[PDB]
Amino acid sequence: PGFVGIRFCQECNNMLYPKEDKENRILLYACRNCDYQQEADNSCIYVNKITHEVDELTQIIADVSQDPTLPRTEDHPCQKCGHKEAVFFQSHSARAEDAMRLYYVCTAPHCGHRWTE
């Protein structure tokens, strides 16, 4: 599944709370500051991912590629641009170092390609 953001009452630039509609059995995000209503696009209003299985690739930035401290290697090239040189490092993110996972970023600039073997 996926997370859901805040529907925002645009004109007063506030946020909307989900309320049910008795007459027609539909959910409506309405403003408390004023009276503004938006249909509820999906029935999932709140979710809690507890396994903490998050795609850390998205969190990983390509800009770290240029740093000199990190290790460098050529074993695994960049898939899209074929570049041989890649930099492999660790999560540095809590409750995720329990598993030693190697994250590779291409050294070729302008591609910023990241992936996990």
């Binding site: 401290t69 990190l70 598993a99």
Partner: protein
């Protein structure tokens, strides 16, 4: 490369430290045994230790063969800097 099979009852991490400590402990034990094996029975170090007056069997292996691992609060030296003990080393290295 993630082929390690985590030991039941503990994390892959702690399993890794336990394996490394086991390797190093075995190496140090074998080294000390080999060292103290050969001393010609004339060494004054051996004389004193055998007599038990001052020292202990582990005392020689530091001076002759090798120092052996060093510990702070009963573990490996921590990552005082960002994941690297000393700047002379590279980030995320676990070499002895």
């Amino acid at each position: 490369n993630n082929e390690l099979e985590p030991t039941p009852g503990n994390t892959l991490r702690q399993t890794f430290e336990n394996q490394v400590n086991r390797i190093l402990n075995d190496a140090r034990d074998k080294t000390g045994s080999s060292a103290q094996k050969s001393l010609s029975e004339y060494n004054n170090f051996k004389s004193m230790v055998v007599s038990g007056a001052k020292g202990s069997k582990i005392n020689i292996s530091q001076v002759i063969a090798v120092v052996g691992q060093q510990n702070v609060e009963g573990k490996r030296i921590p990552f005082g800097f960002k994941h690297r003990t000393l700047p002379h080393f590279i980030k995320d290295d676990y070499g002895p």
